[PDB]
Structure 1
Amino acid sequence: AGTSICTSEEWQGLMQFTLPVRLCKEIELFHFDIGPFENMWPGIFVYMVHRSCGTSCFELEKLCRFIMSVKKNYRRVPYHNWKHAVTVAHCMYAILQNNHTLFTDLERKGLLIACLCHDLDHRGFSNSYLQKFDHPLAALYSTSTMEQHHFSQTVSILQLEGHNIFSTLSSSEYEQVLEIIRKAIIATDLALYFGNRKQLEEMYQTGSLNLNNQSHRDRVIGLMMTACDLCSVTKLWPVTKLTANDIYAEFWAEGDEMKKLGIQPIPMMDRDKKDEVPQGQLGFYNAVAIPCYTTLTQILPPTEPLLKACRDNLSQWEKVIRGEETATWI
């Protein structure tokens, strides 16, 4: 109940944090893994905002309050947590850096914030679960149920005293950025991805795609959000495999709850069906990840390293299926 708020110690501590110099160079690369640097994650986000948007984009105090309160409103769930938030924001940073002038100052600031906030207050349950069992959230939010909640949580945090990093925008730009953030968070509903990718693929192939057309921009930003949300599949294989362990930890816990309610879960969420995981991952890469990065690379050529890495990980799941896995640690 209610929106959590960071301590004075938390945000002043972030304000005084300095990132090690060696990491500056690494943070620029798509394949960077934040995993080994947990104490640095909020600082890494500051660095990224400052480098993409400028050190004077946001009031430092308000930015640090905002970031540390965001962290406190992610739950201690296995996957949809603070680590995932920062990972997704880093992918967006890398995309923005490589495509900087295609996006406005307002878009870049909105999108980095949108990524950091896009899974706020996730409870470890899917839209499928919330709607099957008529959680109050599904009554309030008929479609894109959790994503509408994540956006509401974002607005809640911005409304905390001293947390409104967007207050200094003109009334007009303020409305525009909240709309950028809303559309971007809603776009993280994978249900909407399939239609979005199909549309973009067609606009690209026919040559009608036009980034001066707001509806096209929205769709391209949507596909960027998908690419960033799924970016664990673009890391080096050991990182991808460890992250999959966390994703499935969540899935199996939801599946367990469904069993208690008399319903057999999908195999993906069934802890007694772990043998089907490699084929399930193959399915996910073929149906979701590979097409996403394929179309993204067509539209934004600098994003090709994401696709190449995704392809390498597909090959790894294939090796698993053929019985070729080597030693893994968890």
Structure 2
Amino acid sequence: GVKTEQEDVLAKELEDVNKWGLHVFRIAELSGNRPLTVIMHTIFQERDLLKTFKIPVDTLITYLMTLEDHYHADVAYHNNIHAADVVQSTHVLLSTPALEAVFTDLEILAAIFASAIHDVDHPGVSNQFLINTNSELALMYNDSSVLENHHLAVGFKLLQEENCDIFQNLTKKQRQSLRKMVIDIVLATDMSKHMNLLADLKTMVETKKVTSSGVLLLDNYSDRIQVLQNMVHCADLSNPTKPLQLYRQWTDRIMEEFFRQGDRERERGMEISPMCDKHNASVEKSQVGFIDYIVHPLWETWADLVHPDAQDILDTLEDNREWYQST
């Protein structure tokens, strides 16, 4: 009852779980394509979430495997590795010193669970694509945040699977609170909400309060959920803040996915999408624009909220930005 050698090299990689720039791809490999399961497990143990919420470990594992298996292995970007990465990144963001002892264990569980489910059963195409193709998912969710609503529905329906109810010992009060938070968080990962989340984050930073010296004061649900919503959205838009070896893989995967959507948008005679076209796109200027217009404004406002904790991350983003510019 000691680890195999593979289990051991995995456990040594997993000591980076609290670091920005974990070797998540390596984790995926070493875990037999189980990054989401192993990383969630580690985080749950680290944060003592099993004891706090009286989660049987077999139940946790069973749910996690089930959740991981409803990510599509044939989708290059929006798969279980991306889920794992958003989870781990949210995990690191929650540990930021500006937020020390701000959040309850239920809010922590919410942010992390939300991260893990937030792209589950993603088909590798966009909301617009789905809406324009008259897809069942678009009709189900009356064309409004189609994917997000689906990810939430799937992540919650899976709890009904044999020995999958990880929330089985929570009170009704706890469950209702957790559910609301998770819905609010995942719905906020729809890029059509980015501007309003960013605005709200900007106004919160201007009127920012602090107590005991250092630590943010959030004394209402609106503010509390806003911070968690923006935290996970930062995690979701965190690829360009990661070391370049990591960042480049992410870009490659998203391009495959978008070019493949583009291929389907000519295989279907449709109108091609913003940056979804091979022998006809600049990958580098698009990334620069992605960084200038979306990723930097968000991370700069975050870094401002948690000053000085996000400096190295904002630095790395600015370096990667310079790097991509040279081409």
The TM-score by the shorter chain falls in which range?
A: 0.7 to 0.9
Aligned residue pairs, count? 304
One-letter amino acid of the counterpart of residue 90, structure 1: Q
Going from structure 1 to structure 2, the CA distance change for 1:90 and 1:264 (only over 3 Å counts) comes to same
Conserved 8 A contact 2:90-2:112 = yes
Structural mapping, 1:33-44, within 5 Å: 33-38=23-28, 39-40=30-31, 41=35, 42-44=37-39
The CA deviation at 1:306 is 2.6
1:71 paired residue number: 68
1:114 paired residue number: 114
1:158 paired residue number: 159
SS of equivalent to 1:101: coil
2:18 paired residue number: 28
Conserved 8 A contact 1:18-1:43 = no
Conserved 8 A contact 1:95-1:303 = no
Cα distance between partner residues in 1 of 2:169 and 2:194: 33
CA-atom RMSD in angstroms: 2.0
1:174-203 CA distances to partner (integer Å, 9 max, x unpaired)? 111111111111111111111111121023
Residue of structure 1 aligned with 2:251, choices 225, 244, 250: 244
Residue of structure 1 aligned with 2:295, choices 289, 295, 301: 289
Conserved 8 A contact 2:83-2:117 = yes
SS of equivalent to 1:123: coil
The CA deviation at 1:272 is 2.1
Cα distance between partner residues in 2 of 1:163 and 1:233: 34
Cα distance between partner residues in 1 of 2:306 and 2:59: 33
TM-score by length of 2: 0.87
1:84 paired residue number: 82
SS of equivalent to 2:301: helix
Identity %: 24
2:201 paired residue number: 200
SS of equivalent to 1:269: coil
Cα distance between partner residues in 2 of 1:103 and 1:53: 15
Residue 136 (1) aligns with residue 145 (2) = no
Conserved 8 A contact 2:40-2:87 = yes
The CA deviation at 1:267 is 4.8
Conserved 8 A contact 2:302-2:310 = yes
Cα distance between partner residues in 2 of 1:207 and 1:45: 32
Cα distance between partner residues in 2 of 1:304 and 1:168: 40
The CA deviation at 1:266 is 2.6
Q: Higher helix proportion, which one?
A: 1
The CA deviation at 1:249 is 0.3
Cα distance between partner residues in 2 of 1:237 and 1:20: 22
The CA deviation at 1:24 is 4.8
The CA deviation at 1:97 is 2.1
One-letter amino acid of the counterpart of residue 116, structure 2: L
The CA deviation at 1:55 is 4.2
> Structure 1: which 5+ runs fail to align?
1-12, 321-330
Cα distance between partner residues in 1 of 2:15 and 2:76: 29
One-letter amino acid of the counterpart of residue 43, structure 1: V
Residue 211 (1) aligns with residue 218 (2) = yes
> Structure 2: which 5+ runs fail to align?
210-215
